[PDB]
Amino acid sequence: RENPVYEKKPKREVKKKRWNRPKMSLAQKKDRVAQKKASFLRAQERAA
RNA sequence: CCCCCGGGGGGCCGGGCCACCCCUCCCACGGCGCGACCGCUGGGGCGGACUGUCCAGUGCGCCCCGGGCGGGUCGCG
């Protein structure tokens, strides 16, 4: 009751890094399918 | 006020403009050439992330570019 005022914590500038995983792009998403199919074949003639 | 045959015709002197040939402004429009500002799509380096049942591949960030493409705005010839 004698000091209800709130003093925010001082905001320090941060190193500005990224802990999260960025979203994959279309070119990458589309190229992975080409590798998955190609690797599925180049693994199939090894059995052949 | 004159002139040619009472009726038809011809002039009076100044000024500016267009006709032709010379020169030259600003503007409009179109064309050709050039330069500047924006847009789009090849290289290299750096940094980082990711993918692929062979070491290969794919964006993104920054920077430098040789460009290519195209239109707008601006400025010339």
The secondary structure element, H or E, covering residue A44 is: helix A44-47
How many Å from the CA of A16 to C1' of B32?
55
Sign of the torsion angle spanned by Cα atoms A32, A34, A36, A42: negative
Query: Quick one: tokens of A47?
Result: 């059995």
Strand B reaches within 7 A of the A41 CB: no
- Name, in order, each residue with C-beta under 8 angstroms of A35's C-beta and a sequence gap of 6 or more: none
Strand B reaches within 7 A of the A20 CB: no
Does residue A4 sit in helix, strand or coil?
Answer: coil
How many Å from the CA of A22 to C1' of B53?
26
How would you label A13-44 residue by residue, b for 16+ Cβ within 10 Å and e otherwise? eeeeeeeeeeeeeeeeeeeeeeeeeeeeeeee
Asked how this structure was determined, the answer is cryo-EM
Query: Quick one: tokens of A46?
Result: 């090894």
Query: Quick one: tokens of A37?
Result: 């199919």
- End-to-end Cα spacing for chain A: 84
